[PDB]
Amino acid sequence: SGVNNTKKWKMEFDTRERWENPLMGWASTADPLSNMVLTFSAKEDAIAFAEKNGWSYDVEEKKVPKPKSKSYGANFSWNK
Amino acid sequence: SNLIEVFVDGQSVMVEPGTTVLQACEKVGMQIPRFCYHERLSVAGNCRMCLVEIEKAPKVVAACAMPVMKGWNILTNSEKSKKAREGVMEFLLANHPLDCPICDQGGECDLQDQSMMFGSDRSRFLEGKRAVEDKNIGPLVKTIMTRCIQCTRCIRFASEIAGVDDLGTTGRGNDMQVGTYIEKMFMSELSGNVIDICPVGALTSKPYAFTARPWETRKTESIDVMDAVGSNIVVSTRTGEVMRILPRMHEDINEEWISDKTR
Amino acid sequence: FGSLKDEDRIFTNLYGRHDWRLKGALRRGDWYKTKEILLKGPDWILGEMKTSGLRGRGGAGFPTGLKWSFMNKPSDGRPKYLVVNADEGEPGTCKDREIMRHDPHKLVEGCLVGGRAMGARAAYIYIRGEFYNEASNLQVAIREAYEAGLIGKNACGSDYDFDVFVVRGAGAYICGEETALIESIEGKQGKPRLKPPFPADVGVFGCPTTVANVETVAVSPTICRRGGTWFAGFGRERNSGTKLFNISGHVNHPCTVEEEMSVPLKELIEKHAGGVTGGWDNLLAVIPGGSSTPLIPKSVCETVLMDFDALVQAQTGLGTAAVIVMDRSTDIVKAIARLIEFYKHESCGQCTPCREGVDWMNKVMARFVKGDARPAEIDSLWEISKQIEGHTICALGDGAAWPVQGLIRHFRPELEDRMQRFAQQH
Amino acid sequence: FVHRDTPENNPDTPFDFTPENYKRIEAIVKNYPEGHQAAAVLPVLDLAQRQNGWLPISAMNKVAEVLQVPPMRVYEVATFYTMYNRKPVGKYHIQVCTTTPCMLRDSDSILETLQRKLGIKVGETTPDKLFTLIEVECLGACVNAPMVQINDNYYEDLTPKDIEEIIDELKAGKVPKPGPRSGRFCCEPAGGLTSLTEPPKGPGFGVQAG
Amino acid sequence: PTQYVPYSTTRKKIHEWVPPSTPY
Amino acid sequence: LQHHDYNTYTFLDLNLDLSKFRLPQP
Amino acid sequence: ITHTGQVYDEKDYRRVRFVDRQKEVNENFAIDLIAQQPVNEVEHRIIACDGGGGALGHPKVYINLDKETKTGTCGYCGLQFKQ
Amino acid sequence: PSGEERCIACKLCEAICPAQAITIEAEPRADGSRRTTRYDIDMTKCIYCGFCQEACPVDAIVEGPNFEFSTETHEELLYNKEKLLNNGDKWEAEIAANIQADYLYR
Ligand SMILES: Cc1cc2nc3c(=O)[nH]c(=O)nc-3n(C[C@H](O)[C@H](O)[C@H](O)COP(=O)(O)O)c2cc1C
Ligand code: SF4
Ligand code: SF4
Ligand code: SF4
Ligand code: SF4
Ligand code: FES
Ligand code: FES
Ligand SMILES: [Zn+2]
């Protein structure tokens, strides 16, 4: 329930092939930019990185939990 | 109008009247360590791991519970509200069975972290521990309930989010065990959410019992196709095969919950 | 200075001695000015208790008038209610068992006198289920009263309506708690609620409610009859009025006497009741308010007297004013140890600090009686004690910590020796 | 706290309130506020206990049925309170008060005597199923400390021998004069009535003006 | 005090549908 | 000696008897 | 063959490896070894399981041998305990 | 000693390995217990730090005394669970003596 990992924006490259290795069965990948996830503090700065580096981008708006009204007294209401 | 001003460590946040002390800290950005409080579940106050210290007040208050009043400055990192957490964490851990390398909520534990950040460096419980008896809640949820911190979020979800009203507390004292009195399986859709909502790894998923451990799981955010609600979900993949699908929050479509079928 | 006159003693039917039934009650003249009092006004009744300055006769001490004043606020369309807790799980509280059994009526008119003060639609009396026979006595008394028309709609020939009910307790000390009495009345598990939704605001069945110790409800009609002043005079400053004192354990004649408050502790065993068994010097310690309050050792005791202000100065609580006395012939380490056993077998377990903490002290206390535990563990239990004192949802965790704190505070050398005794024999 | 279905204790044991009992059941329902029946689970559960001491899983399900509440709701109430017994109870079911007040005044003393007389361990029913001994906590009535509640009898101020006498009375015959079997009445200073030895003032005595 | 061969020991991760041997 | 003897249903049955007196429900 | 029965198969393209060189498999498979372990009878409702030797064992856990119906099995040693 | 392999697949030996050498995948054995289906230490990747020895809660993975395991082929150096378990059985007597001597220190 911690929210400290939902704070900074991250841009992540598209996932690619992960074929099984014949000798040991370890996962093997041919994509170099797979494990790379860069962290950017604001949406504007991350968009800038994609434009100057020439990678295509598809930004997703942050969705933050909506305020929810809670009060211990309210559920004690037999009425409802 | 309807905007009290309460200070969280002197930050003069302003909140609608009726917002809990925990909620006031959230808008400033501070997080009260919490167990037994879930946003879409009723406030219960069972853990009291959220005790904070409103200024000029004799006792510390329950964050999730006290409606913040006018001009009460919350002191979330005081010398008191830390002894109110260093001493609660002493208790939750005291009766806890240390099988963290069995508990598949290893890195997904809201109780090791809070211990590891807000709790105590060492233990003083030189006495003996308790043990409860593992029962069957069904074929999806493995209840190794000797892990349970009696936080009653299951009994809430199983009554409030889903209308099962089966899970309940049984007994009093240190052998209050939150399991079905008679062994009747918890059969309902929305069932698997209990896993995700129990911060302890007491009851966890039986298929995904021991296939992985969370730090390894690469998490890709995708869409539910099993049903037409199109619930948002996160597919956790390790070395290229999917290991688990757990909900990710979409206010409008699935707000933190996913069906038994699509997980 | 105590020594209240028999006339002033409110509960005359104490010990029985007078038909507990109505005809005995009429000779008592308990229903004498009831119509008049209600007629005067609810505001007149609360003026009487405010002038009395009566403190809660249950373990917690608060101005009785202010507590009743809180739900005197205008009705919001929910029926206001009265809850009388006849449960007294605390050891040494045979205090209430008397009024209920011996003088049921006093409480019946206490209920309606109190009822119009809060404008309660009806009153539910939660007598502990253990007392089945006790229940038999009160509803016989309640039945008499309605037959008379003293209670019911147009009760006592007056506009006001009241109905009084008796509810079965089921052997729980915690049921006694104010928010938990309600839940038992509501029919859910007896688990206290948090105070932020205060009892008046959210009542039983979501209808404003108020909870009073049976002694508190019982004295209100007589205090209105005698006037707050008469009652006000006996007390000391904030402390005021006579409160029943029960002396049990290591005293020659253990008994509940309603002698005056502010009594020298040395005086009440020496003058009434029975002098401490074995002599006033055979007093290892005194438990003034029952198990929840910390015990006070002999040197402090006679100096101090039984009133809540004096006791809080002494670091102990008047509470239920149950005096439990321990001669020099008792293993206190084991005496207090069973009270912690009394609380592990009883706390609801709703809150983390009480659930594990009280069990943790029980385990350490049992080792302390054996002497197996080392001396350093003793202040460890100090620290465990205050973690539970300020963090609990209800007061029982408050209550469990205090006896532990008292044992360490005044009897730390004895526990160290029990520590030493076991280490020597290896 | 787990009901593992057993041939004896399981719903095969049918439970239903006697025509007379059902009557009682409703009396309870209207005592509580209208539209509120759930509040009566305890009082009802108590009459199921009055009907039969065992109160098996079948009986609790009926209680929930009659009271139309989540069955668990009844299960939780039964487990929380010690008054209810979820296992068979001895005909006499004596309970010995062992809190510090009674212990200080010898409560423990009594126990040893009763174990020998019943010739059985503390906590289980006699083979005769005649009596069941349990170490219960404060039962109130401390002024009279030595104490042993037997189906509400609440005998008090008992010296070890007295109980043996009582137990015998229970073993042969019935109604063994339940109450404090010592000279004192209810709770009274053994010396007398220092509190009030005068006659009680009558009605309207010194009633304040106003 | 008085030649190995390395191999994967895990099973087939993705089992494969087998075609019906019944002709149609 | 009314206290000395009462039946298991005394409390409940007595109450039912009182039901008639019991004022109307909320 | 092995613990989880690894069986590079007659048609696999990997069974080629063992040609002229043996495979690594285990006798005294563990799967059956604890099954061969006697059930540790106990008196107490709950029992510990240091794994044997304290520091040289497993993080100590307390098992509830409360139901003869089931012999508690410490999740670390796989030792069944018979109430 | 009974014969049950110590590892319970908590997989933090994998987490703390500096070189990414240990690869562990697990599934509940029929017994219901938790065991590793595949445990592969790539010794050529391993830099013999000894943290795995440190990290294991049950101390299932240990740094054994033998240093002479030079191999003709690269594949032999990659080690699966069966080689390591076999290595464990061969050197258990000395490993037990070595852990016996140094555990008080740790
Ligand atoms: C654990 C616990 C047990 C209690 N038991 C009782 C009781 O048996 N009788 C009682 O009158 N008050 C009891 N109280 C106090 C009540 O909650 C409440 O404060 C009191 O009855 C109010 O009475 P008064 O305000 O008239 O003094 C208890 C409190 C706690 C925390
Ligand atoms: S829950 Fe599982 S992981 Fe979190 S602490 Fe208890 S055991 Fe370790
Ligand atoms: S199970 Fe999980 S959720 Fe239900 S109580 Fe125990 S911990 Fe809280
Ligand atoms: S303290 Fe916590 S646990 Fe003990 S009774 Fe009050 S609420 Fe229940
Ligand atoms: S080796 Fe030790 S650490 Fe690595 S998994 Fe097996 S047990 Fe856990
Ligand atoms: S988080 Fe504060 S009450 Fe549970
Ligand atoms: S403790 Fe035995 S009745 Fe009070
Ligand atoms: Zn083990």
Distances (CA, A) of G44 to B134, B171, C200: 18, 21, 48
Please name the residue ranges forming H helices in B123-263.
153-157, 193-197
The ligand placed nearest to the CA atom of residue H54 is 5
Q: Are B169 and B150 in contact (CB under 8 A)?
A: yes
CA distance B82 to C196: 22
Residue B58 makes CB contacts below 8 A (sequence gap 6+) with none
Which residue in chain A is spatially nearest to G16 when comparing CA positions? A23
Inter-helix orientation angle C95-102/C132-148, to 10° = 40
Is G29 strand, coil or helix?
Answer: coil
Name the DSSP letter for residue A27: E
Residue C412 belongs to what H/E stretch? Answer: helix C395-425
Separation of CA B258 and ligand 3 centre (Å): 19
CA distance B118 to B93: 13
Nearest-Cα distance to chain H for B251, in Å, is: 34
Examine residue D120 and state whether it is found in any structural domain, yes or no.
Answer: yes
Distances (CA, A) of G31 to C61, D119, G81: 65, 50, 18
Pocket test for ligand 7, best of D96, D97, D110, D187 (most atoms within 8 A of CB): D97
Between strands C122-127 and C245-248, the pairing is unpaired
Strands (E), chain B: 4-6, 13-15, 51-54, 61-62, 74-75, 141-143, 203-205, 218-223, 232-238, 241-247
Instruction: Please give the full DSSP string across C157-220, using - where no structure is assigned.
Output: GSS--BEEEEEE--S-SGGGSHHHHHHHHHTS---PPPSSS-TTTS-BTTB-EEEEEHHHHHHH
The ligand placed nearest to the CA atom of residue H53 is 5
User: What residues does B223 pair with on adjacent strands?
Assistant: B232
Which residue in chain E is spatially nearest to G20 when comparing CA positions? E3
Do D121 and D172 share a structural domain?
A: yes
Structure tokens given for B36: 């037994």
Distances (CA, A) of C415 to A37, C333, C355, C376, D182: 61, 7, 25, 11, 37
Cβ G24–H82 below 8 Å, yes or no?
yes
Examine residue D205 and state whether it is found in any structural domain, yes or no.
Answer: no
Q: Are C101 and F3 in contact (CB under 8 A)?
A: yes
User: What residues does B245 pair with on adjacent strands?
Assistant: B235
Distances (CA, A) of D155 to D143, F21, G53: 13, 34, 54
Please, which residues 6-45 of chain A have a Cβ atom closer than 8 Å to chain H? 23-26
CA distance C141 to C139: 5
> Structurally, how many domains does chain D consist of?
2
Between strands D94-96 and D133-134, the pairing is parallel
CA distance C126 to C58: 14
Separation of CA A23 and ligand 4 centre (Å): 60
Q: Are C320 and C290 in contact (CB under 8 A)?
A: yes
Do D156 and D119 share a structural domain?
A: yes
Which residue in chain G is spatially nearest to H98 when comparing CA positions? G56
If one counts every other C-beta atom within 10 angstroms of the C-beta of residue B6, the result is: 23
Strands (E), B111-256: 141-143, 203-205, 218-223, 232-238, 241-247
Distances (CA, A) of B85 to B30, B92, B108, C308: 15, 10, 20, 32
Flag whether residue C140 sits within 8 Å of chain A, measured between CB atoms: no
Nearest-Cα distance to chain H for B99, in Å, is: 10
Separation of CA C351 and ligand 4 centre (Å): 5
Distances (CA, A) of A80 to A74, B38, B157, C206: 8, 20, 17, 10
Interface probe for F, chosen from C143, C156, C167, C185 (most Cβ of F below 10 Å), is C143
CA distance B89 to B83: 10
Question: Chains G/C: 3 or more C-beta pairs closer than 8 A?
Answer: no
Do D185 and D116 share a structural domain?
A: yes
Q: Are B155 and B167 in contact (CB under 8 A)?
A: yes
For chain C, counts of helices (H) and of strands (E):
16, 10
Between strands A18-20 and A27-29, the pairing is antiparallel
Q: Are B177 and D75 in contact (CB under 8 A)?
A: no
Cβ G76–B146 below 8 Å, yes or no?
no
Structure tokens given for B247: 């909900």
Cross-chain CB nearest to H75 (options A23, A25, A26)? A23
Q: Are D158 and D147 in contact (CB under 8 A)?
A: yes
Structure tokens given for D115: 């174990």
CA distance C153 to C165: 14
Cross-chain CB nearest to B251 (options A2, A18, A66)? A66
Separation of CA G77 and ligand 8 centre (Å): 4
The answer to whether the annotation marks C59 as part of a ligand binding site is yes
Residue C397 makes CB contacts below 8 A (sequence gap 6+) with C347, C351, C353, C354, C357, C358, C388, C389, C391
Please name the residue ranges forming H helices in chain D.
19-31, 41-51, 57-66, 71-80, 100-104, 107-118, 160-171
Is C110 strand, coil or helix?
Answer: helix
Cβ E7–A20 below 8 Å, yes or no?
no
Nearest CA to D45 out of D81, D70, D9 is that of: D81
Do D165 and D137 share a structural domain?
A: yes
Farthest CA pair distance, chain G: 56
User: What residues does B51 pair with on adjacent strands?
Assistant: B62
CA distance C283 to B257: 64
User: Residue D138 CA to chain centroid, in angstroms?
Assistant: 12
CA distance G54 to G64: 20
CA distance C88 to C105: 19
Separation of CA C176 and ligand 1 centre (Å): 5
Collect contacts of C41-44 with beta carbons under 8 A, ≥24 apart: C42/C72, C42/C116, C42/C117, C42/C118, C42/C119, C44/C224
Which residue in chain C is spatially nearest to A79 when comparing CA positions? C206
Nearest CA to C221 out of C123, C112, C144, C140 is that of: C112
At C261, which amino acid appears?
M
Collect contacts of G67-74 with beta carbons under 8 A, ≥24 apart: G67/B133, G67/D4, G69/D4, G71/G39, G72/B131, G72/G47, G73/H32, G73/H33, G74/G49
| Conformation bin of residue B102: beta by default, left when phi > 0, alpha when psi is -120 to 50 | alpha
Q: Are C277 and C328 in contact (CB under 8 A)?
A: no
Name the DSSP letter for residue A72: G
For chain D, counts of helices (H) and of strands (E):
7, 4
CA contacts within 13 A on the Cβ side of C33: 21
Instruction: Please give the full DSSP string across C30-89, using - where no structure is assigned.
Output: SSSSHHHHHHH-HHHHHHHHHHHTPBPSSSS--BHHHHHHHT-SPP-SS--EEEEE----
Residue C109 makes CB contacts below 8 A (sequence gap 6+) with C30, C31, C34, C150, C221
Between strands B74-75 and B51-54, the pairing is antiparallel
CA distance D132 to C102: 30
Separation of CA G81 and ligand 8 centre (Å): 10
- Binding region of H for [4Fe-4S] cluster: 7, 10, 13, 17, 46, 49, 52, 56
Residue B32 beta carbon below 6 angstroms from any ligand 2 atom: no
Structure tokens given for C45: 């009744």
If one counts every other C-beta atom within 10 angstroms of the C-beta of residue A62, the result is: 9
Nearest CA to C360 out of B150, D80, B93 is that of: B93
Cβ D196–C9 below 8 Å, yes or no?
yes
Q: Are D189 and C9 in contact (CB under 8 A)?
A: no
Separation of CA H91 and ligand 4 centre (Å): 55
* C79 backbone dihedrals φ, ψ, rounded to 5°: -70, 130
Is B172 strand, coil or helix?
Answer: coil
Which residue in chain G is spatially nearest to A24 when comparing CA positions? G14
Nearest CA to B147 out of B236, B35, B263, B38 is that of: B35
Nearest-Cα distance to chain A for B128, in Å, is: 30
What is the domain range of residue A65? 1-80
Is A76 strand, coil or helix?
Answer: helix
For chain B, counts of helices (H) and of strands (E):
6, 10
**What lines the ligand 7 site, CB under 6 Å?**
C 91; D 97, 99, 101-102, 138-142, 145, 147
Structure tokens given for C69: 């004043």
Structure tokens given for C224: 């209105």
Do D96 and D52 share a structural domain?
A: no
Flag whether residue D138 sits within 8 Å of chain C, measured between CB atoms: yes
If one counts every other C-beta atom within 10 angstroms of the C-beta of residue G5, the result is: 9
Examine residue D58 and state whether it is found in any structural domain, yes or no.
Answer: yes
Query: Which residues in chain C are contacts of F10 at CB distance < 8 A?
Result: 132, 135-136
> In the sheet that H22-28 helps form, which strands lie side by side, from edge to edge?
H22-28, H34-42, H78-79
What is the domain range of residue D161? 89-194
Q: Are H41 and H22 in contact (CB under 8 A)?
A: yes
CA distance B219 to B222: 10
User: Residue D78 CA to chain centroid, in angstroms?
Assistant: 15
Query: Which residues in chain B are contacts of G60 at CB distance < 8 A?
Result: 98
If one counts every other C-beta atom within 10 angstroms of the C-beta of residue A17, the result is: 11
Cβ F12–D43 below 8 Å, yes or no?
yes
Q: Are C112 and C162 in contact (CB under 8 A)?
A: yes
> Structurally, how many domains does chain A consist of?
1
CA distance D140 to C131: 8
Atom 1 of ligand 7, residue of closest alpha carbon = D138
CA distance C415 to C160: 59
Residue B172 makes CB contacts below 8 A (sequence gap 6+) with C172, C174, C346, C347, C348, C349, D80
Do D102 and D74 share a structural domain?
A: no
Is C402 strand, coil or helix?
Answer: helix
Q: Which domains does chain C have, with CATH numbers?
A: 1-53 (no CATH), 54-233 (3.40.50.11540), 234-330 (3.10.20.600), 331-426 (1.20.1440.230)
Nearest CA to B248 out of B238, B262, B239 is that of: B262
Residue that finishes a domain, picked among D60, D88, D116: D88
Q: Which atom of ligand 3 is nearest to the CA of B152?
A: 5
Question: Chains G/H: 3 or more C-beta pairs closer than 8 A?
Answer: yes
Q: Are B59 and G23 in contact (CB under 8 A)?
A: no
CA contacts within 13 A on the Cβ side of G32: 6
CA distance A47 to A38: 12
* D117 backbone dihedrals φ, ψ, rounded to 5°: -60, -50
The ligand placed nearest to the CA atom of residue C56 is 1
Separation of CA C289 and ligand 1 centre (Å): 12
Name the DSSP letter for residue D25: H
CA distance C343 to C351: 14
Cβ F12–D47 below 8 Å, yes or no?
yes
Farthest CA pair distance, chain C: 77
First to last CA, chain H: 22
Q: Are C155 and C194 in contact (CB under 8 A)?
A: no
The answer to whether the annotation marks B25 as part of a ligand binding site is no
Do D183 and D93 share a structural domain?
A: yes
Nearest-Cα distance to chain B for H64, in Å, is: 23
The answer to whether the annotation marks C156 as part of a ligand binding site is no
Cβ D31–F8 below 8 Å, yes or no?
no
If one counts every other C-beta atom within 10 angstroms of the C-beta of residue C68, the result is: 25
Examine residue D173 and state whether it is found in any structural domain, yes or no.
Answer: yes
Do D32 and D64 share a structural domain?
A: yes
Residue B160 makes CB contacts below 8 A (sequence gap 6+) with B41, B42
**What lines the ligand 3 site, CB under 6 Å?**
B 148-154, 178, 198, 200, 202-203
Strands (E), chain H: 22-28, 34-42, 78-79
Locus of tokens 């993080």: G59
Name the DSSP letter for residue B257: -
CA distance G4 to A25: 14
* H41 backbone dihedrals φ, ψ, rounded to 5°: -90, 120
Nearest CA to H79 out of H52, H103, H56 is that of: H52
User: What residues does C212 pair with on adjacent strands?
Assistant: C84
- In our burial notation (b when 16+ CB lie closer than 10 A, e otherwise), range B198-211 reads bbbbbbbbbebbbb
If one counts every other C-beta atom within 10 angstroms of the C-beta of residue B227, the result is: 13
Q: Are B99 and B210 in contact (CB under 8 A)?
A: no
User: Residue C67 CA to chain centroid, in angstroms?
Assistant: 16
CA distance B212 to H9: 9
Interface probe for F, chosen from C15, C112, C139, C146 (most Cβ of F below 10 Å), is C139
Query: Which residues in chain C are contacts of A76 at CB distance < 8 A?
Result: 193, 197, 202, 206
Query: Which residues in chain D are contacts of C399 at CB distance < 8 A?
Result: none
Flag whether residue E10 sits within 8 Å of chain H, measured between CB atoms: yes
Do D113 and D96 share a structural domain?
A: yes
Query: What's the burial of B252, exposed, middle or buried (CB within 10 Å: 0-12/13-18/19+)?
Result: exposed
Cβ C387–B62 below 8 Å, yes or no?
no
Residue G42 makes CB contacts below 8 A (sequence gap 6+) with G65, G81, G82, G83
Structure tokens given for D112: 């040893």
